[PDB]
Design a protein around this ligand. Structure first.
Ligand SMILES: N[C@@H](CCC(=O)O)C(=O)O
Ligand SMILES: N[C@@H](CCC(=O)O)C(=O)O
Ligand SMILES: N[C@@H](CCC(=O)O)C(=O)O
Ligand SMILES: N[C@@H](CCC(=O)O)C(=O)O
Lengths: 415, 414, 415, 414
C-alpha cells in the first residue's frame, strides 16, 4: 500500500447519513448510506484503503463571480486537498473542463415538489354553512311570534268563541306544518288569520329558494379548483413562489438556459424578492412545510422521490422530469487511478450491484402506505359524511317522543 | 457651450428615479437616466461633460399669458439658464414658437383614471332583483283575475244558490294558497273549477323554478360594472368632478379646443369651483384615492399604465385615448447642439433601442400582473343584510293583522 | 402656363366618391367627397388649373422587395406621371426618403373591426327548451295511463262499488293535482292505489328537480361568455381569423415593428392560409359581414368610424388605437409647389377650415346611434318575453272555462 | 484530390420532410427538416461534401437472429454504402461497441400514447348518480323506523282501541306521503305524534335541496373520465392490449431490464398471442385510432408531442415518461470523418443553435390551442336516454299494482 486515498463526501440522505452513535465509532465506520457501500466496493475491487472526509464548506460549488475561484467539493478536488470524490456530484460541461468524470452510473431529472393541499373532512354540522348563525336565530324567533299572534287573534269574544279549533297548541302545530310546506289538516277562517297565513307562506317561499341556490353555487365553485400541473402554470402564476438550492448546478442550468419557459423562470427567480434561494436541502424542505402551500421547491428527482415516501408523507411530486443528467465518480485532472475506477464502475454495473444497492436503500425506508393515490377523484358523488348530521336530529326526535308518550301514559293513568 | 452642459431633468418615476443613497451620490450617478444616456451618444461623440441636473422649479414649466413669461424648464431654457432638456415634455406649437424640438421618440395621448370599483352593501329590498318590475306586477293582476273567474262559474244557478263555499273572499283565499304551494282544503269539485285549478298550478311551478335557477346563476359569477366609460358620460356627469393638471399643457389644449364636446368640457372646468386643478402627480394620486366616489383625474396614458402596476393595484384606466401627441427633446432656438442630437434620436430609432428603453421600466416592473377567474375564495354564507327586507314585510303584516280584528270586535259591539 | 397640373387620387369613401350622375357629367364635378372639396382651397391659394386623375393600378403601393420598383400613387409620383397627390396617403419614413410631404392635416390610429354579436331574440315558447321535446311528449302518456289504471283498480268490486269516490273523472282529477305538487282533497284507500300514488310521487319528484337544475346551468353558462375585449388577445385567440389590406401601410407595420405580440401576429399572418389578405376595402368589409363572428379586419380608425355609423349599422369598433400616424399632401422631390402647399395647409389649419370641411362629411352621414342609456337590457333580470308564453296558457284556460259553464247552462235550462 | 461522402437518413415527419417537387430533385434538395438542416449546418462547419440518400431498407430494422448481422441503416455504414448517419436513432451500448457515436444532440425517453377519451352513452340508471350509494339505504331504514314508531306511539293506549285511525298500514302510508311532498289525509292529534311528524318534514326538505343543488353543479364543468393513470394500471389490467414498434430499441431495453414491472410487461408481450408488434409509425397510429382505445402504443415522446399537434387532436400523452436516452450521429469504426463532425456537433451543442431548429420544427408548428379550451361549448337539453330509467320503474310499478287487485278478488271469491 502506498497511501490511504483521501475521499471527499457531503452529507445527504440516503447517500450518506450519520450513524446512530457515530461519535463512538471509527472515522470510516461513523457513516452509513448508499455511498459508504459504493466506496467499500471500490476499495475492494481497486485494492486500497480509504479515509472518508466531510466537505468543510458543505456545498457542491460553482465558478465564483468575477474571480474564477472554485469553492466546495470541486474546489477540494482542483486544489489537491483530496484525491477522489464519491458523492451525488452531477456532470456538466462547465466543470468537465477542469475535473474528470467516470462513466455515468445513475440517471436523474429535475423535479418539482409541493405540499399536499388539505384534509377537508366535513364537520358534523357542515350542512348549515350556507345561511350563517344569525339567519337561523332570526327564523327561530319569527316562528314563535307568528303562532302567538295567530292564537291571540283566533280566540276572542264574538261580541261563540269555541267555534274554532285554533287553541294554543294547535296554533303552534299549524305554523310548523306551514313552514315545511307539508300542508295542514286545518285552515284559518278569519281575515286576520288569512293575512297571517299568506305572509308566512311568502316568507317560506323566499327562504327555501335562497338556501338551495346558494348551496348549488357553493358546490359548483369547488369543482373548478384546477390545481397547478405540468410546471407550465408557474410561467403565469404569481401567488405562488419558488426557488432552488444555492451553489447547486440547478442554479447554473436555470441561469444559463434560453428556452423561453425556463428563461421566464430565471427572470422571475432573479427578480423575485426577498431571496427565494436556500442554503441546505433540509431547511429548504422545512421551508416548504412551513409555508404550507405558498412556497414550492425544485430539486433532483432522485431526492424528491426519496422524501415523499418517508414517515411524514406530507409532500408529493408534481409533473415530470424536465431534462436528463447523470452522476459520476470524479477525480483530479491526470490522476492515474481514474481509469481503474472507471473499470470498477463498469464491472459493478455488469454485476448488477448498482441495482441491488438501490433496491436495498429506497424501498425499505418507504414506510408510507401511499394511500389516497388519486385513482378515484371523488367520483363527484356527495358522500354520506356531508349530510350525516341530519340523521342524528331525526333519531333524537323519535327517541324523545317515546319518553313523551310514556309520561303521557303515567299522567292519564292517575289524572 | 463651454465643452460642458447641465442637462435639464425632472424626477418622474417612469423616466428618472432617485437612488437610495441620495444623501451622498452626486452627478449623473445619483440616478439611472438610461432614458437619456443613449441619446447622449452624440454627447459621447462631442465628449462634453453632461450633468443630469434637477430642473430648478421642479415642474414641467409653463408660459404665462400677456407677459409671456416662461417658467421653470421653459424659463431656464429661454433665459439661457439651461441649455438642453431631455425631459418628458409634450410637443406643442405654443412652445415651438420660442424653442425647437427633435423628432419625437414616442407617441402617447390623453387618458382618464378613476378609483377601481368595489362591491357595495346590499340593498334592503335586493331580494326582488331576479324578476324585474314588470313580472312582479303582472303576477298580481293574474291572481286577481283567476280568483274572480273561479268565483263566477262556481256560483252558477245550481238546480238553491250558494250551495258551495266559493264566495269571493274564499275564492281569493283559495287562489292565494294555491299559488304558494300550500294545503287548500276546499276543492272545485266541478269541471270549470278543476280546469282553473290545473293551469294555475302549472303556472306557479314554472315561476318558482325560474326564480331559483336565476339566483343560483347570479351568485356564482360577479361583475362590478364600471359606472362611466366615455367623455360623453363626463359631459352628462352627475357629481364626479374632473380637471387636468395645473400648468400642464393639456390645460392650454383645452383652452384652445374648439370641438363642441371638448369646448363644453373646458367651459365646465373653467366654471367649476376653485381647486378643480391640481399641481403635482402625487396630489392627483392622493385626491383620486381619497375620492372614494367624488373626483376623477386626467393624465397621460403612459403614466396611467405605469401607476396601474404599482401597489395598491386599486386604480384603473377607462375608455380609449382622446388624442395623440409626441414626446421629445427640447432645446433653445438654433442651438449648435440641438441640431446634431436629432441624428442620435434617428439612428437610435433605427437601432430600435426604444424597445429596451420601454421594457426596462414598464415591463421589468410587471409585478401586479394578470389576474383572472382561475380559482376563487369560498363564496361564504349568505349574510343577514342580503335578505333583511323579507323580515320587515313579515313583522309589518303581523302588526297590521291585529287591527282588523280589533275593528271587527268594535263593529260587533252593537 | 402651368399646363393643367395633374393630381392623382384613389377612390375611397368618404375622401372621394363617384357622382351619381357621373355617367354623363364631365370635369372635376364628376366627384364628391372630402378630398375633391379640399382641392378647391389649394387652387384658391395657388391659383392654377388642375385635373383629377384616377390611380391606374388602384393601390397605395410599397417597395416590392427583391425587384425594388415602386408602384401605386407613389409610383406615379416618383416616375413623373403625377404632379401632386391628395389622398389618404399616410406618412412613413420609408416613403419620406423618396418623396416629400407637407405638415400633417389629420390624425389617425389603427383599429380592429368585428361583426355585431346577433341579439338572442326570445322565443314565444323558449321556456320549454331545457327539457327537450320527447320528454314533454311522453309525460302525457304516463299521466293518462296512470289515471286509467288508478280508476280501473279503484272501482273494481271490493268483493259494493259505491264504497269509494274514485270515479273516472275524479281519477283523472287526482293525477293532475299530484303532478304539480299541490296536494289533493282525497286519498286512495286500497293497497294497490297507495302503491300507484307512491310511484307517481317519486316520478314527479325526479322530474321537477332535473328541470330546475338544468335550467340553472343553462343560464349560468351564458354569463361567462366573456367576449373579446381590448382585442389584444387576438394574439392568444385562434378560433377567429383576421386580415389586413394588401400593399397598405398596415401591411408594412406588422413586419417592421418588432414588439413580441406584433411579432406573433405577423407570424400568424404569414402562416395562415387561405390568405387573410384582401385587395380592396369594400370587399374586405364584405368578407367580414358574410363570415360573421369568425373573421375580423384591421383598418385605419378614421375609416372604421365612417363605416359603423352607416344604415346597415351591423359592425362596430372594438378596443383602442394601437399607435398614431398622419396624412399629408405629397409632391415629387424638388417640385416648387411643395412649400406653397405647406403654407396653404398651415393657413387653412389656423383658419380652422379643415373642421369646416370635416364636419359636413361625418356628422351628417351618421344615421345610427342607438345605444343603451339610462338603463341597460343586459343587466341581470329576466325579461317578460323570457316567460311570456306561460301567461297565454293561463289566459286561454280561464277563457275556455267560460264556454264550459255556458254549455252547462244550456243543458239545464231545458231540463 | 476531390472527395465526397454518402449520407443515410429516414423520412421521419418532424425530422425530414418530402419537398413538394419530389419528382426529380436530388436528395440534397428533395428534403427539408431538423435532420436536413442539422446536416447542412454540420457540413457548413466541417466543409466536407456529401449527398443525402434515404436508408435503402426504409426502416430501422431488427438484428439478424443469433448473428446480429446489422440492419439496412447500419449495414450501409458497415458495408460502405455510406460513411455517416444522421437519423433519429437510439444510443445504446449494444451499438456503441460496433460503431462510434457522436455526443447526443437531444435527450428523450419512452412514453405511452392512448386515444383521447370522449363522452360515453349515459347509463340507463344514471339518475341515481348525484346522491351516492350508501345514502339510499339509510333513507329506507329511516322511513321504516319512523313508520313503526309513529304507529306504536299512536296506538299504545292513548286513552285505547278505536280511539284513532293510525293503523300500521296507515302509518306507513302517512310516512310515505310526508316525504314526497303531497296531500296529507290525517294528522297526529297527540303531542308525541306531532313531535314525530315534525322532524320528518325538516329531513325531507334538506335531502331534496341537496340533491337538486348537486345535480346543477354536475351539468356545468363536466371534466370527466380518465381511463389510465399510468402504465402501472396497464400492467394491472389486461383488457387493453399494447406493444412496442417492432425492431425498436425499446424491445431490447425490456429484453434485459431487471425492474419487476417492466420484466412482467416484457414477459407478457413476449407471451402475448396476437400480433402486438407493429413495423411502422403509421401502422401504430392507425392501429390505435382504430382500436377505440382498446390498444395502446409505445413510442419516443418527441414523436408523441408532434403527432399530438397534427390534427385531429384525438391522441394524448399520459404519464410522466419512462426513462432518459440520447439521440446522436453515428460513424463506422476507423472512418476519418468521425471526429471532424463530432467537433462540429460539440460546436453546435455549445452555441445552442439547436434551439432555433427545435422552435422551427416543433413549436412553430403548434396549432391545437383547443387544449386551453379557447372556445366555450354551449349546453344542450337533456335527452330521453339521460333519465329513461325512471319510466321503467313507473310502468313496472303499475304492472305490479294491477296483480294485487286480482289476487285480492280471488281471495274474497269464497
Ligand atoms: N447536488 C446537485 C444539485 C442538487 C440540487 O440542487 O437539487 C449538484 O451536484 O448539482
Ligand atoms: N406633460 C405635459 C404636462 C401635463 C399636462 O399637460 O396635463 C406638458 O409637457 O406640459
Ligand atoms: N391609404 C392608407 C391605407 C391604410 C390601410 O389600409 O392600412 C395608407 O396610407 O396606408
Ligand atoms: N428506432 C429507434 C427507437 C425505437 C424504440 O424506441 O425502441 C431505435 O431503434 O434506435
Amino acid at each position: 500500500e502506498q497511501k490511504t486515498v483521501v475521499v471527499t463526501t457531503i452529507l445527504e440522505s440516503p447517500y450518506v447519513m450519520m450513524k446512530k452513535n457515530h461519535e463512538m465509532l471509527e472515522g470510516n465506520e461513523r457513516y452509513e448510506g448508499y455511498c459508504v457501500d459504493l466506496a467499500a466496493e471500490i476499495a475492494k475491487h481497486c485494492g486500497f484503503k480509504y479515509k472518508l472526509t466531510i466537505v468543510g464548506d458543505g456545498k457542491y460549488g460553482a465558478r465564483d463571480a468575477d474571480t474564477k475561484i472554485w469553492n466546495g467539493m470541486v474546489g477540494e478536488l482542483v486544489y489537491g486537498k483530496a484525491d477522489i470524490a464519491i458523492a451525488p456530484l452531477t456532470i456538466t460541461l462547465v466543470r468537465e473542463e477542469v475535473i474528470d468524470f467516470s462513466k455515468p452510473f445513475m440517471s436523474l431529472g429535475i423535479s418539482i415538489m409541493i405540499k399536499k393541499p388539505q384534509k377537508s373532512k366535513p364537520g358534523v354540522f357542515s350542512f348549515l354553512d350556507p345561511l350563517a348563525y344569525e339567519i337561523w336565530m332570526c327564523i327561530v324567533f319569527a316562528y314563535i311570534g307568528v303562532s302567538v299572534v295567530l292564537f291571540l287573534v283566533s280566540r276572542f269574544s264574538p261580541y261563540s268563541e269555541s267555534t274554532n279549533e285554533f287553541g294554543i297548541f294547535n296554533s303552534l302545530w299549524f305554523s310548523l306544518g306551514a313552514f315545511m310546506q307539508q300542508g295542514c289538516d286545518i285552515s284559518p277562517r278569519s281575515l286576520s288569520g288569512r293575512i297571517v297565513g299568506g305572509v308566512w307562506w311568502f316568507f317560506t317561499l323566499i327562504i327555501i329558494s335562497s338556501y338551495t341556490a346558494n348551496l348549488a353555487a357553493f358546490l359548483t365553485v369547488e369543482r373548478m379548483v384546477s390545481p397547478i400541473e405540468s410546471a407550465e402554470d408557474l410561467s403565469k402564476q404569481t401567488e405562488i413562489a419558488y426557488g432552488t438550492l444555492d451553489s447547486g448546478s440547478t442554479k447554473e442550468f436555470f441561469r444559463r438556459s434560453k428556452i423561453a419557459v425556463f428563461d421566464k423562470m430565471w427572470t422571475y427567480m432573479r427578480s423575485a424578492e426577498p431571496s427565494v434561494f436556500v442554503r441546505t436541502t433540509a431547511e429548504g424542505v422545512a421551508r416548504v412545510r412551513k409555508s404550507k402551500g405558498k412556497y414550492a421547491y425544485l430539486l433532483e428527482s432522485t431526492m424528491n422521490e426519496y422524501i415523499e415516501q418517508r414517515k411524514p408523507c406530507d409532500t408529493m411530486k408534481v409533473g415530470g422530469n424536465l431534462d436528463s443528467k447523470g452522476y459520476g465518480i470524479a477525480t483530479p485532472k491526470g490522476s492515474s487511478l481514474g481509469t481503474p475506477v472507471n473499470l470498477a464502475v463498469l464491472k459493478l454495473s455488469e454485476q448488477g450491484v448498482l441495482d441491488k444497492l438501490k433496491n436495498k436503500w429506497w424501498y425499505d425506508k418507504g414506510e408510507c402506505g401511499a394511500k389516497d393515490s388519486g385513482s378515484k377523484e371523488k367520483t363527484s358523488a356527495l358522500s354520506l359524511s356531508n349530510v350525516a348530521g341530519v340523521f342524528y336530529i331525526l333519531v333524537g326526535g323519535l327517541g324523545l317522543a317515546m319518553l313523551v308518550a310514556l309520561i303521557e301514559f303515567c299522567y292519564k293513568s292517575r289524572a
